[PDB]
Every structure is written in C-alpha cells, then in structure tokens.
From a paper:
The four blocks can be combined into a complete map that contains an intact asymmetric unit yielding a final resolution of 3.75 Å for the HSV-2 C-capsid. The resulting density map features well-resolved side chains consistent with this resolution, allowing atomic models for all four capsid proteins (VP5, VP26, VP23, and VP19C) and the CVSC to be built in. The cryo-EM structure of HSV-2 C-capsid reveals an icosahedral assembly of ~1250 Å in diameter, similar to HSV-1, HCMV, and KSHV C-capsids and HSV-2 B-capsid. In HSV-2 C-capsids, five copies of CVSC density are arrayed around the exterior of each of the capsid vertices bridging two triplexes (Ta and Tc). Unexpectedly, in contrast to the bi-lobed head observed in HSV-123, only a single-lobed UL25 is seen lying between the space of two adjacent penton-VP5s, indicative of the high level of flexibility or sensitivity to proteases possibly due to the exposure by detergent treatments. A five-helix bundle from five components (contributed by αi from the stalk domain of UL17, two α2 helices from two UL25 conformers and two C-terminal helices, α36-C, from two copies of UL36) and a four-helix turn (the hump domain of UL17) make up the stalk region, which bridges the penton-binding and Ta-binding regions. In summary, a five-helix bundle in the stalk region, a large hydrophobic patch and two sets of three-stranded sheets in the distal region drive the assembly of these five components into the CVSC. We note that one CVSC contacts two subunits of the penton, two subunits (P1 and P6) from single P-Hex and two triplexes (Ta and Tc) in an asymmetric manner. The N-extensions of the UL25 dimer insert a number of hydrophobic side chains into two hydrophobic cavities of Tc triplex, one within the VP19C and the other at the interface among the three components of Tc, stapling itself in the Tc.
HSV has a characteristic particle structure comprising a DNA-filled capsid (~125 nm diameter), a proteinaceous tegument layer, and a lipid envelope. All three types of capsids have mature angular shells (triangulation number T = 16), composed primarily of 955 copies of the 150 kDa major capsid protein, VP5, arranged as 150 hexons and 11 pentons. Compared to A- and B- capsids, C-capsids have significantly higher occupancy of the capsid-vertex-specific component (CVSC), comprising UL17, UL25, and the putative UL36 proteins disposed around the exterior of each of the capsid vertices and implicated in DNA packing and capsid maturation. The CVSC reinforce the capsid structure to withstand high internal genome pressures and may signal the completion of DNA packing, thereby initiating nuclear egress.
Residue numbers in the entry:
A (entry chain Q): 3 to 16, 23 to 45, 76 to 97, 104 to 170, 181 to 354, 417 to 466
B (entry chain B): 100 to 109, 118 to 491
C (entry chain C): 541 to 589
D (entry chain R): 6 to 52, 57 to 122, 127 to 164, 172 to 190, 195 to 230, 235 to 262, 267 to 318
E (entry chain B): 1032 to 1374
F (entry chain S): 1 to 164, 175 to 318
G (entry chain C): 1228 to 1276
H (entry chain C): 198 to 207, 211 to 246
Write the structure that this text describes.
C-alpha cells in the first residue's frame, strides 16, 4: 500500500516500463498517425464489500493446474502425512489379471498377481485409489541399502495410518510388489504420478485430495492464511544424488526423477524406489544408470525404469536433511525446497 | 612528455578501461509479498502488526544490500592494486636499471636476471627473516615508500591532516603486522584526517545526432534540422555548466578517523582493513596471499673423485669389525618433513615412474630423430 | 596376520584334523593359530639378522 | 489464439445440425492460419490413403480442437499454440474407452468404423482420442492381425482398459487398409535379424567388445543364432551398405508408430474418470 | 626392463641410475601494499534491479557496472611479502604413478602386464582403487584421515649417475639445460634454440651443453614422459610438478618484456589446488592467484638434504658447521627464499 | 518467464575487436550446447575449448556423444555485452516460438522434425573463430530427420570398415557428400555396443514365425511392384532366401496363454525403431511457418514449435 | 585399517603390528572393552589410547 | 585459541588438518609461559 | 525505524561509589588486575580454584 522503498515496492506489485510503454501509446497523444507537417459488523462487512472492490480495483504470480480426486483411504493417508508429499495414481486393477496372462514369460505363475491383489482387498477392509510415497517406501523397505531409516519409515506408518493392522497392509502390498515383477507386469506400468499434496477433505473411508498436477509448490494458497506454505519432504532411503556420486558440483537447475530398480530372480525379487536429483539431460541419464546399478543387471528387459518428476529452478539448489516428526516418530527426512512440478512418461525395459 | 636533456656530440598514452560487474541477491518470500502488496490485509491489528514485521525485513535487507557495494569497492581496490604490484624483491633491481641505463644491450638484459634471482631469494620474506633487527626494517619501510614513481593525476581535493598537510599514499597490511610496526618501528603523527566527500562527474563533449520527425518538406521544416542541432548543442553546455556549478557548491571535506604515519619524508595513511570490511563474512582478506616453490632432490648420484674423502680419520666409524655403510653408493635421502619429521625417500619409491610400460615407448624418438636424413657412418658395429 | 608376538596366524585348511593324508582337500580356509616356540621363529623383518 | 474455418454456403438443416453435434472434436489443419476453408479439413484433402498414409499425414498436419461453433465459421483453437495460451480447453470423447485423469492421450486414425455432409458433398473422418498406453497396443494387435493373413488366436481381438471390454473384430477392407504396414513391419525385421546373424559370426571383433557380446551371447544370442542358422546358411555381400539402408528404413517406422501424446488431462472439480461421449478438460502446458 | 627393475629396486640393488626428485609446495604469506596520491582511476556505474521468480518467491539481483583504469605511468603501487604462515602442502614424499594416467601402449604379454600392474598399484597411497573408467579419470583412494595438510607429489627424472652434485647446491633447472623467454635473444628460433639445440652451450653454465643428456634433448626419454605434446599423463588428475619445465609450447608462447613479466608473476595463476585432498591439476572453475618466482626463472630450489642421517644431524647447527661430503655420502644445503625463516 | 522463457545469459568479455564483435551479429539463429542451466555463463563454457577433454578433442562421430550430455539452446539476440539463449527443453519464449537459421545446404518443410548434426558436410565446416580471444564456435547443422539418420548411419558404417564410396548422399535429386574423415576407435566402440544391445534384445522367439515368410515375399515381389520396389535391388533378404530355407518349431513353451507375434512387435519397437534416437539426439524441434511458405530454404530463418 | 596409510606418518601403515591392529597383542590387554585388569585399582595409563 | 581465531576468519578438509598441526606445536610451546619467557620482557609484554 | 533506542538502554545510572582495586592498563584498554585469595578463600578450607 505505497511504501517508500518505492522502486522495489512497485516492482513487487506484479512497472515503469508499462507506464512508459503506455506513455507513447496512450498518454500521448492524438497521434497515432495524424495530419501532416450495526456496531461491530457493518462497517466490518461493508469494508469487506470494499475489499471485494479492493479485489476489483486491482486484479510475479505463477500459474498452476490444481487437481482433485475422490480417494479411498486404504493405501494412502492424507491426514497422517502432512501437506507436501508425493502421490501416485494407479490404473484400475481389473486390468491386472488379464495383462499378467500375456506379459509374464512362459513357466511363471500368472495366477499369482490376481491372488496377491485379492488378498490386499480383504486386508485393508478389516476403486482406483492412490498410493502415497511414504507408504511405498516401507513396502520396498526389504530391498534397500540403508535399512534402518527404512524401519523409521516403517515406525510411523504402523502407528499413524488410519486402518486396522497397517503392517498387514504393508506386508501384503509388498507381496503384491513381489508378484508384480514375477508376473512381469512392472510397477512402472501401473504407478502413475499424481501431484504433490496441498490439501485434502476428510470423510469416512475416503478423502478428497487436492494436488498440483503441474506447477510450482510453495505459493499455492493452502487454505491456512497464516501459512500458505508447504515444503516437499522425502524419506532418506529414496533420496539419491548424482552431483556427489559423479563429482558434478557445478551450479545449475537440478531435475528430480523417480527410478525403479528391478531384480528378476526365482521368488526373491527386489524393488527399490529412488528419487534421483540430477543436472543431466533425461537422454543423458541411461548411461548413468549403467554405472551404478549393474548388480541387479546380472541377477535378472532392463533393470531400470524412470520418468521425470519435477525441476528445481535454483542456480544453486538447496536441500535439507532433517529429522521431522510424524506424530511422535523421528524420521530422517530429506526436505526439498522450491520444486516446480512437471510430469512425464516412463521408459521401457522389454 | 619525456624529459630530454641536451647532449653534446652527434607522446600519448592510451589505456583500455577494464570493466566489471558486482552482484547481490535480495530475495523475498511469498509470505511477505501478500502483506507488502496489501493483499492479505485485514482490519485486524494482527494483520497489521504482521506487516511492520515484514516491512522492516526490507529495510534490514535493503541496507545490508546497499552496504555490500561500498564494501564492494573497498574490496575491488585491494584486488586491483595487487595486479599493478610487482613484488618488492623484483623491483629494486629494476628501478636501478630503468633509472640509470634503461638500455638494450643484451648484457644489460642479462645482468638483471642475475640480480633478480638473487635479490628475490634473499629479501623475499623480510620480516620473517631479519625481523629481530631494527635499523634494517626501518630502512625496509623506506624502500616501499620510494619504490613507486608518482602518478599523473592531480586530484581536485587532497586527503590531509588536521594541520592540513597532504597525504601521499596508503599502506595496507594485515593487523598482525600493523600492531607490530606501531610499537617499535613507527610513530603515529596524526589521528584525524580530512577526506573529500562528493564523487566526481564528467564533462560531456559527445557526438550529437538527430532523428527528427517531420511533417511537410520546406526550408523552415528543413532548417529546423539545423535549428534542432543548435538547440541540442545549446543544451549540453547548460548540462555541463551545472556540474561545475555543483562541484563548487557541494560540501567537500569532512573529518575522518584514520592513522597518519610519517615515514621518511612523507605522510601515509596506515590502515588494516580486515575488521571494517572483511570481518564476519565468508570473503578472505585478499592481502593474505600464496606461494609456489619447487624443489630438487637428487637420489642416487655419486660423488666425484676429488670429493670422496673424510674430514678426519676416525670420523664416522662403524663398531669395530663391522662394514661401513658409508662407503657404499647411496640409494636414499633424508630431509626434513613439514612438522619436523625425518622423512625417508629412497629408490624403491621410483617404481611408479619406471616400472610403468611407458619407458619402452621409443617410437617418437626413432621417427623424431630420422626426420633429417642422416649420413652413413662406418658401419662396423651396426651391421651383422 | 601378524597380531601377536608369541603366535603365528596363517590360512589353514578348515575342517581338517591332522595328519590327514597325502593331499589336503580344496575345502575353504580359516585362519589358524600356533605357538612360536623360540625366538628365532620371529619373522626376520622383525628381528633383523 | 483461435483460428477460423468458414463454412461455405448452401447448408441444409441437418448438415448444420451435424456440425452442431461435433462440438469438441479434433481437426487437423495444414498451417496455423486465420482464414481457412472447410475443404482443407475434409477427407478429400487427403487423397484415399491407407493407415500408413494417415499416420504420415497426421504428423505433418497440425491438430486443433474445435471450440464453440458459429453458424458461419468453425472456430478451432490449435493444440500446439493457443492451448499453451489458453488455460484449459474441453475435448469430447468419441472413443469407446473411458479416459481417466492424468492420461496422456494421442490420436488414432478411424480404423474401427464419420459425419458426411451431403449439401457440401464431402465426408468428415475424425481421429479417436484414446490413451497412449492403449495406442501402441491397438496398432500392434492389428499389425499382428495382418501377418496371419499372409500364410490367428481366439484371443488378441479383445482388449481390457479400466474394466471395459473392447473388440477389434467388432473386416477384409480393414486388412487391405493396413496391408502396407504389414509389408513394412515384416521387411524391417527380416532385414534386421539377418544383419545381426551375418555380422556376429562374420567379425566377433576381438577384445572386451566381443567378450561382453559373447557374455550376452552365452546361450542367448548364439543359441538364437544356431537355431536360426540351422534353417539358414552362414562373391561380395554388401553387409556394411545394407546397415545404412536398414537404419534408415527401420528408423523411419519408429517415427510413424511413435504416436506422441498431445492431450494431458488434468480434471479439476470433476470426475477423475471421464466416460465415453463426455467432454474432458484438456491441457498441453504446465 | 620395466619388469627387471621392479626386482632390482625393491630388493635393494642399485642399478646405474639416479633421479632428480621434484615437487611443488604452497605457503600462505602475509603481504603489504603501497600506493600513491592517485594510482588508479575508478569508474562506478548505475544499479540494475532484475526481478526473477522462484518457488521460494521473488528475487531481486542487483548489479553495478564498474571499471578500472591505471593512470600511473610506471610502477605506482607495490606489494611485498612479509612473513609466512603454515605451509599448506605438507612437504612429504609421495611418489607419482603412471598407472593413474593412461595412454601408453602396454607391454605385449597380457600376463606380464597384469603382473606388473597388480604388483605396483596394489597397496599404494595413490594408485587407483577401482580399475580405470574408460572415460574420465581414475580417482585416488579416499583417506581415512589427514593431518599435516595435503601431500606433495614427487616425480622422478632418471639421470645419469655421473652428473656432478655441485649442480644441485645452487638453484637449478630440473631439465638440466636452462629455458624460458627470459634468457633468450631476439630472433624467431631463439626461445627454442635454447632448449633443444645442443650444439650451443647452456646459458646457465656455458662450459657444457647439458647436465642431463637424457632429459634435455628433443624426443629424449625425458620429454616423452613430461610434455604437453605427448599427453602421456594427461589422463590422471594428480598434479605433475615438472610439467611446466618440460612443456615446450608454453615457454615459447610467453612474451619477453621484463617491465611486464615482473607484474605478471605477482598475480600468476596456480597450477594446483589447496582445496583438494592430495594435489590436483586445478579444476577450471576455481582459480588461485599465486606468485611464482619459478614462473619467470624456470628454476627450482634445493633443500637441506643428505644421504645419511648422521651427516644430516650436523646441518641443524648451521651452515659452516655442516660437513658436506663423507666418503661416498653427501649433503645439500638449501639456497631458497626460505633460507633463514627457521620455518 | 522462468517457465515461459528462460534467459540464460552468455556474457561477452571486455577485449574483443570490432571486426570480431561484429562477426557475432551474424550469429542469430544458432545452437549453443549449454552444459547446465545457469543464468550467467561465459563463452569459454560455450566454445569448443569447453568441449575438449584432456589433450583430446574428439572427431565428428564423437562430437555427437557430448551434445546429448548437454542442453541445446538457441541464441535469441546478440547484445554488445551479452548473448541470450533460451534452452529448448525448459521453455521456448513468451509465446513459445523461436527462430533458427538454416546453416544446412538442405531446404526444410513444414511440420518435419529437425535434428541438429555436427558440421560433417564438405565445404560446410564453418566455425566462427574469435581472433581476439582464441575461441572457436562449432555451430551444428539443423537437418531433416530423413537425412539425419542416414548421415549418422554413414559414419557408423565407416568406422566398422576400419575394423577389418560410403560418404556420398542424395536428397530430392540434390547430390551431396560429407567429409571423409578418420575416426577415433574409442568413439566407435560405444556406438557398436549401442547397436548390438539394441539388436540382440530386439530378437524374440516369435520372430522365427516372421522368418518363415521370406520366400513368400519373393513370391510376392514378382507380382506387386510395390513389394518389388520395397525390398531393394541390393537388399539382404533377396539374397537371404536363395541360401536360406527358414522354418519354425512345432510347439511353444506355454503357447496357450502368450502371443508369439505380439511379443515380437513390442520388443522390436522398443529396440529397433528406438535405435535411431540412441545414435543421434532427439529431434525436439519442428518448423511451423505460420504465413510464410511450405518450404524453408537455406540461409533463411524458420519459426519453431516444440515437438513431443 | 592396515590396508591404509597412517594419518600421522602416511608412508607406513603402523609403527607396530603387535599394538595397532584389532586383536593385536596390546588391544587384548588394554582395551577397556575386554575388561581385563578392571579388578585392580591401580591406574593403567594407556587405557585411553 | 590464538591459532583458532586465525582459522575462523577464512573450511576444506585440508584447512581442518593444518589447524591440528597448528594447535599441537602451539600447545607444546606456549603452554606454560612465565616459566619460559619469564626472563625476557618484550615477549611477555606481548 | 530499523535501529532504535534499545529498551535495554533507558535505565538511568545507578549510584556509583569509590572502591580500591587496581586498574592495569594493558594495550589500549583498562582491566581490573585482581587476586582474590585474601579477600576470599582465607582461613576457609575451600581451595583457590
């Protein structure tokens, strides 16, 4: 409201160029081309009417594409997890038993994926829903490298998620994931990215989650007027850099990816979901997957599958590595800052 | 204009302006935009007292930004002067050479490179070496002061004492040295000095060009060109005449606290900046520099004939009845490591430079020697 | 494999009591221990001639 | 940005009503241009091409979504430009497949089954806005259909997406509509597998290159070699010249059968699954 | 023979070589300036606010174009070097490996080659832990912990035993024959004529052609290992100190004006990095400014050194107390800049 | 303008001669391989001295192999103090349309994807050299994708002749030839390994059914002129039927639930049609002239709309 | 770790095998962990090494 | 301290290292002082 | 206003008196040079810390 650091205070208002650009156009002149040569409220609500006029007398500011979905609360819990997590949409699981009959190699149990998925519906009930990312880490927790922080993921899920026997949801869905790779229906063929959390609506057995399917993060008016701010949080088992592991320490915008690792063995099949931060082209990424993860190459068609997730627009991108609280549980959480979401498609194996 | 002295018997300088740009980042946060913009405002004082908190966060940041520029200059200068500055040890030979001879005989060029090396080796770090003495160091300071020839510019105003005596230049050291000098080796003969305030400006004689919209073609309309010229050239003088009228008008000198030392014949600002500027930032004080030296240690060489001997008879005697490891060709070294260790460096470390398959790559040589056609010598032992 | 003054630690042949026969098996190994008896059994690098 | 396609005069009552029906339907146009004739859009502008000719055409032409239809001109926003300008433009399903949220959607030529205007004397065929995981499948099933007619299974004609059943049979006209792709998909493989087979025993160039190749060929490629070279053989054979001829041809078919997504559905305050015949909010912009 | 030696060296024999070891070091000094009534004219511009947007919020980034002109004719400002703090590089003994480097044709027997390499790189302060990546550079093993500061990398120039020690009691040139545009004359081929022409005589000691027949001459055993031309060690990251001595294309490239050369060894750019763990050819991003005497003079400096501890212990008493040479043994006593610092 | 444009600003130094500075004013529609997406860069990170490795600047076949490790960007305007380029991948402009410039000898069309290739052609390797700075700018060549696959194909085939003419092309009746050049063998090894792994994985058990159909094609090429033109005069399969009698095995392992030819196509598409994208870089750019013409000639600019 | 240099004097792995290495002769005696001399009240100086 | 303050004004892995050397030798020397420089004067005053 | 009158600073001066203790001037500053083992710790069996 017109302060006196004016040249910045007018600069934050959306300039002098728009005044000078309308000066030669509109402020001067008749040229373009011419001839030659009622005590407490009202005025409380009355200035609120004027606030609508203040909303109408005027109106950078980035854009979004907010999305909503009516979502069952079996697998994910938008109440237990705070605003600012990853989310994952799914295909409808009636396509699961038929595609396993044609994509699984000969000699493998194609009945296994339809049976393992059916046991999950009777275990979370003691309809294409949504998988939250923290729930997915405890499922693939039995394949990682840092196993203690994967148990820190498992420490809060069994105590904060709504439902009965959340550990039985975990150990059955992890059995579903071991039935995914065995029936060759890869989880990247099912897991689809759905935007980062901003808010949700509570209801019995289902929740209406809002999310940004494309755009930046922190300037969404969350609904809370004190804090329209919510940082992106990732557990420490999934956060993988390629600036430190490849000695690329230069500044530049850092991309964010999702990466699946596949190990194809007889009834011992591993799954690991990683969030890869990089300064690389997405076409200049598959060679970097060859250098690191050649161990799952031999034990297996590719072992890797990946897609874009978002971009950090910072010159020197800033990350945090803290221990936050999901209720009473201290989890080592990699908090990311300033993320501009742009999704993409997965990449192939067979 | 070079001095020229009449002997018996039979000029413009053009320098390129360096150019640089200095940066700072001011950034805000969404939280405080809504307030400053006026958007999130309510009638509640709480909504209001949330502004003032986020109005002041500009004042704090703006100042700490604008401030970073006056510290920017004070930084650049030290970073600049270091690049005008030949080290002493290399000068005093030069100034003796340029003043006297300034002559192109190859021997002259040659006799420097003798004087340079040996001056440098000896006088490089002076206060570390001769520091205990005094009449030396009192004469070393006097060399700094006289090594530079005065410069061309004559400033509009001149930094001076309280008394008004002018000031001829600026020592800049670390504080560790400054404390040292101010005890034994110097005296501070003034406290407050007078310093100019206003910057300069420029007088503009430019190339004056016109693009003038015109409606109709006639002499007056055309003469307006000639007219608008004079109008425009009449304007510059009015611009310039203000500046001179401004520079004479503005306040000029103020009182400032800084140290004035009399060295030899000349007063000098003696100052050490690491507090005012470089204290409590991530920037190193540029005046703390670096060195590269390279050393040569021989390993297995062997004494000449005259030089194999012993300074006495029984000098270094193995226990009676035992061999003398002295008399063998030596394969090792010994020298002083960093912290006062006795290191050991022997042949067996050479493996990495020798056992490598490279030493059997001849092929550059054979081709490289045979570029020039070589004659046919007696081929008595080269032929089977 | 030099951990102690009074003992020797070597790679034996695990799971073999002895004397076992002419040609010990190719089975895996395990570090064993024996008792140096006298001084001279000290390695020459550690008691130079 | 929104272009214009003027309807030429002489329109009957249903021919204006049929164009009133196709509100949110996809249209290919030659260039982004303000003024444009309706004969440029119609099926007569393509001549009748096969499935191969339409896919080469649908890469070169520029897709546009018809917005609100005026009685005089068809207004259509181009996908590449005005949709990056405008926020979100609706799009009607003409597919039997119901779209979910977040599905990248490409287009397919109408191989399945087509508004004809009699007074203007022209046909209008339209692309089918179906999702990209199905899009590479429905083509590959039909390419596998045409190979068996060059001498099938009781399955392979039935597709499942999102609980919905399809039938690709639902025919001989379609098989001759697709015969040129079969003559290219067969030849690009038979040229391909021979150049693999006539080079690895020809060179196996050694040190670690052939050894890592043989590590990959340890009863996997060499067993597939010895199984094919059993019903095969082992002057100058133009081996190196045929690789350029093969990479140009087989590299071309990857471009044609790529089927890139343009539509990305971000529904907001709506159903996460959009049914057949309904309009879907569509963006191609972040 | 590269195999035959690895026996003769390890097991204690002395073959007919000797080396002149070379290494580089870095010392953090404390300088002093001086200047004059106006030694520089300094132009400052006008500020520019650039508004950018980021998930964190709006950003302002301010710039002020500035410029520098030095209007003094002659030398108007002087820096000197007062004292010395901690020398950054430890003065160590770390030998260099050529197995970090790559680009030499391996000896023909795949048995014999792998036999050497495994018997050299194994157990090495330096040599590669992993096999070489086909692109990039092999990484030096990470060290559990460090103490004295980063470690110097010695080098070994094989040199014939007979060359007299008395060459080394004075600052010399490892190559054995002087170089550099400093000494040369005015002609085109001069800066080269010095180095590789052995018809003439060494400008440093005119009474001989060279002190290293092996290291001085074009295409010699010396050049082949150390040059920019042959890119033999170009693979490995580790700084090779003698690089700047034998690299021919650099010396000729420099200009000869002494009025200038002085100033430009004040600010000279390091070939090394303190920030690294051991020592590394500098990464292009960071720059250090370092004064190189050895940049001008193409010389190196000897140290206190001896082939006996006994004969060494007598050095600390001073200079004139030092017995130089016992029977075959010998001592070397440093001439340097560091001569009296007692550092 | 962070998402719409992205002004990556290449700074220009102080000392550049006015003949060298005015040589950059003809560098309007170009391609600059940014290593990162920093908002402030220098010419040394852009020029070929950034591209060179330790001692080795690679050949043209290797010059592809670090383009795809970088970020191609197009110069928008050459100011006296800086050069501004928007990266192709992030965001094109406000409206999303940037202009290139045909340094090709080849005329373009509307809607065709445009691949950028190193300067391989003869009389074409024109690198704008900074004499005032000793810097070269190897400007790549925007080309049509029916050429840009063959041009990579001639280079890869030339290196494998050199492990035991070819450098002549044609396009729309225009004869043209590229520079015959010796190739570093280190560059060829990653190429040849990239062929075979996409060739071995492209073979499936159902492909043996397709192999049986080879004598049907020569039975068909005697009647259809379309098939008679399709194979080639110098095709392999025309020679690979007179010495080869293919056959299929009788039964399949679990041949009731799985599809033999449908699995043959998907593994083929994922490796063989995908293979041209792995050799070159992806043509993320096509040309949509709004009002100009249908054919964009050499030397002229061309509007660009991004290409999925 | 005796596969590595010694941060103090890098050119060797250790000054003693008998002391440095885990399960050396020394560590068996003087590791407070093994709790050998823990009975006696008399100070053991090297306990903290 | 006297070594620390010098270090706090610049933090690699290397810088840390030389501090250690700096501290040791500064401790093994200036630890007790008036017993050592006690006879001198200029040193104590400083 | 960014800087202010610090609320900590608005108290008036307390009552000062005269006290015998030694002010040594070291460097540029004054310092109490003080030894307490008489005023305190005298005939009280607490040690001088």
């Amino acid at each position: 409201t017109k302060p006196l650091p004016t040249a910045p205070m007018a600069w934050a208002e959306s300039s002098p160029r728009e005044l000078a650009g309308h000066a030669p156009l509109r402020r001067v002149l008749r040229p373009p081309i011419a001839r030659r040569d009622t005590r407490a409220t009202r005025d409380d609500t009355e200035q609120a009417v004027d606030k609508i006029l203040r909303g109408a007398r005027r109106a950078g500011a980035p854009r979004y594409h907010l999305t909503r979905q009516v979502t069952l609360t079996d697998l994910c819990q938008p109440n237990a997890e705070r605003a600012g997590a990853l989310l994952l949409a799914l295909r409808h699981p009636t396509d699961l038993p038929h595609l396993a009959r044609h994509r699984a190699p000969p000699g493998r149990q194609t009945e296994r994926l339809a049976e393992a998925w059916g046991q999950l519906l009777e275990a979370s009930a003691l309809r294409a829903g949504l998988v939250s990312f923290n729930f997915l880490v405890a499922a693939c927790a039995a394949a990682y490298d840092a196993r203690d922080a994967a148990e820190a993921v498992r420490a809060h899920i069994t105590t904060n998620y709504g439902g009965t026997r959340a550990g039985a949801r975990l150990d059955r869905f992890s059995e579903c994931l071991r039935a995914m790779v065995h029936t060759h229906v890869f989880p990247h063929e099912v897991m689809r990215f759905f935007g980062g959390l901003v808010s949700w609506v509570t209801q019995d057995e289902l929740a209406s989650v809002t999310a940004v399917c494309s755009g930046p993060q922190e300037a969404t008016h969350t609904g809370h007027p004190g804090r329209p701010r919510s940082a992106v949080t990732i557990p420490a088992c999934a956060f993988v850099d390629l600036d430190a592991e490849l000695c690329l320490g230069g500044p530049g915008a850092a991309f964010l990816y999702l990466v699946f690792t596949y190990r194809q063995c007889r009834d011992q099949e591993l799954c690991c979901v990683y969030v890869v931060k990089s300064q690389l082209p997405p076409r200049g990424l598959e060679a970097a997957l060859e250098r690191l993860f050649g161990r799952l190459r031999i034990t297996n068609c590719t072992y890797a599958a990946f897609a874009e997730l978002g971009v950090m627009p910072d010159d020197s991108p800033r990350c945090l590595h803290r221990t936050e609280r999901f209720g009473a549980v201290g989890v080592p959480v990699v908090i990311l800052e300033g993320v501009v979401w742009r999704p993409g498609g997965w990449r192939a194996c067979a | 204009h070079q001095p020229l002295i009449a002997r018996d018997g039979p000029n413009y300088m053009t320098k390129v302006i360096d150019r640089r740009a200095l940066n700072a980042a001011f950034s805000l946060a969404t939280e405080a935009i809504a307030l400053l913009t006026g958007e999130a405002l309510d009638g509640t004082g709480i909504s209001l007292h949330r502004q003032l908190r986020a109005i002041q966060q500009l004042a704090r940041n703006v100042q700490a930004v604008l401030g970073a520029f006056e510290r920017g200059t004070a930084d650049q200068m030290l970073h600049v002067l270091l690049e005008k500055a030949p080290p002493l040890a290399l000068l005093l030979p030069m100034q003796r050479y340029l003043d006297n001879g300034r002559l192109a005989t190859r021997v002259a060029r040659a006799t420097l490179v003798a004087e340079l090396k040996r001056s440098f080796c000896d006088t490089s770090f002076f206060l570390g070496k001769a520091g205990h003495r005094r009449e030396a160091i009192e004469a070393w300071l006097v060399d700094l002061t006289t090594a530079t020839q005065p410069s061309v510019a004559v400033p509009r105003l001149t930094h001076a004492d309280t008394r008004g005596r002018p000031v001829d230049g600026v020592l800049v050291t670390t504080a560790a040295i400054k404390q040292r000098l101010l005890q034994s080796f110097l005296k501070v003969e003034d406290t407050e000095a007078d310093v100019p305030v206003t910057y300069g400006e420029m007088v503009l004689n430019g190339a004056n060009l016109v693009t003038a919209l015109v409606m109709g073609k006639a002499v007056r309309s055309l003469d307006d060109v000639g007219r608008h010229l004079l109008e425009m050239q009449e304007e510059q003088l009015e611009a310039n005449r203000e500046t001179l009228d401004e520079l004479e008008s503005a306040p000029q000198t103020t009182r400032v606290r800084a140290d004035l030392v009399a060295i030899g014949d000349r007063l000098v600002f003696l100052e050490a900046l690491e507090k005012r500027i470089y204290a409590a930032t991530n920037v190193p004080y540029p005046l703390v520099g670096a060195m590269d030296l390279t050393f040569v240690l021989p390993l297995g060489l062997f004494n000449p004939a005259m030089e194999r001997f012993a300074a006495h008879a029984g000098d270094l005697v193995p226990a009676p009845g035992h061999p003398e490891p002295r008399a063998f060709p030596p394969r090792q070294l010994f020298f002083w490591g960093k912290d006062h260790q006795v290191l050991r460096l022997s042949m067996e470390n050479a493996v990495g430079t020798v056992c490598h398959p490279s030493l059997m790559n001849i092929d550059a040589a054979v081709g490289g020697v045979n570029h020039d056609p070589v004659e046919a010598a007696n081929p008595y032992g080269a032929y089977v | 494999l030099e951990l102690h003054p009074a003992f020797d630690f070597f790679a034996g042949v695990a799971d073999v009591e002895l004397p076992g026969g002419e040609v010990p098996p190719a089975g895996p190994g395990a570090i064993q221990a024996t008792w140096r008896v006298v001084n001279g059994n000290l390695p020459l690098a550690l008691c130079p001639v | 940005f929104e272009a214009d396609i003027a309807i030429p005069s002489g329109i009957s009552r249903p021919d204006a009503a049929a164009l009133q029906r196709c509100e949110g339907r996809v249209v290919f146009l030659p260039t982004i241009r303000r003024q444009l004739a309706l004969a440029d859009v119609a099926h007569e502008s393509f001549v009748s091409p096969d499935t191969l000719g339409l896919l080469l055409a649908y890469r070169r032409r520029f897709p546009a979504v018809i917005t609100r239809v005026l009685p005089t001109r068809i207004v259509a926003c181009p996908v590449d430009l005005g949709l990056t300008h405008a926020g979100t433009v609706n799009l009607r399903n003409t597919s039997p497949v119901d779209l979910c949220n977040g599905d990248p959607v490409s287009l397919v030529p109408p191989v399945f089954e087509d508004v004809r205007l009699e007074s203007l004397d022209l046909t209008l065929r339209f692309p089918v806005p179906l999702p990209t995981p199905l899009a590479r499948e429905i083509v590959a099933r039909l390419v596998a259909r045409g190979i068996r007619d060059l001498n099938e299974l009781p399955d392979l004609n039935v597709l499942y997406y999102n609980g919905a059943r399809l039938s690709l049979v639902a025919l001989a006209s379609v098989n001759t509509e697709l015969r040129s792709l079969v003559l290219n998909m067969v030849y690009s493989i038979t040229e391909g597998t021979t150049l693999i087979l006539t080079l690895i025993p020809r060179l196996l160039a050694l040190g670690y290159v052939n050894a890592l190749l043989q590590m990959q060929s340890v009863t996997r490629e060499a067993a597939q070699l010895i199984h094919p070279e059993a019903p095969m053989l082992m002057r100058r054979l133009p081996l190196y010249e045929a690789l350029v001829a093969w990479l140009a041809h087989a590299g071309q078919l990857g471009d044609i059968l790529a089927l890139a997504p343009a539509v990305r559905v971000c529904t907001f305050d709506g159903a996460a699954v959009v049914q057949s015949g309904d309009m879907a909010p569509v963006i191609r912009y972040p | 023979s590269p195999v035959a030696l690895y026996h003769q060296l390890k097991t204690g024999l002395h073959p007919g070589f000797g080396f002149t070891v070379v290494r580089q070091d870095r010392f953090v000094t404390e300088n002093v300036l001086f200047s004059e009534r106006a030694s520089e004219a300094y132009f400052l511009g006008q500020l520019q606010v650039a508004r950018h947007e980021t998930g964190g919020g709006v950003n302002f980034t301010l710039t002020q174009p500035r410029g520098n002109v030095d209007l003094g004719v002659g030398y108007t400002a002087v820096a000197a070097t007062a004292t010395v703090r901690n020398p950054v590089t430890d003065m160590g003994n770390l030998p260099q490996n050529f197995y970090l480097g790559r680009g030499a044709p391996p000896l023909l027997d795949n048995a014999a080659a792998v036999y050497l390499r495994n018997a050299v790189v194994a157990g090495n302060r330096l040599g590669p832990a992993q096999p070489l990546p086909v692109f990039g550079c092999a990484q030096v093993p990470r060290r559990a912990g460090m103490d004295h500061g980063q470690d110097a990398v010695c080098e070994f120039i094989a040199t014939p035993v007979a060359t007299d020690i008395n060459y080394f009691r004075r600052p010399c040139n490892p190559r054995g024959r002087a170089a550099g545009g400093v000494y040369a004359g005015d002609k085109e081929g001069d800066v080269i004529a010095l180095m590789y022409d052995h018809g003439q005589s060494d400008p440093a000691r005119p009474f001989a052609a060279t002190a290293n027949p092996w290291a001085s001459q074009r295409f010699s055993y010396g050049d082949l290992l150390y040059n920019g031309a042959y890119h033999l060690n170009g693979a490995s990251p580790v700084l090779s100190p003698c690089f700047k001595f034998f690299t021919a294309a650099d010396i000729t490239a420099k200009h000869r004006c002494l009025e200038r050369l002085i100033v430009e060894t004040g600010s000279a750019v390091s070939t090394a990095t303190a920030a690294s763990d051991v020592q590394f050819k500098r990464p292009p991003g960071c720059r250090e400014l370092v004064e190189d005497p050895c940049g001008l003079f193409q010389e190196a400096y000897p140290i206190t050194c001896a082939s006996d501890p006994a004969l060494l212990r007598s050095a600390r008493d001073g200079e004139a107390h030092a017995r130089e040479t016992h029977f075959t043994q010998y001592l070397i006593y440093d001439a340097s800049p560091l001569k009296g610092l007692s550092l």
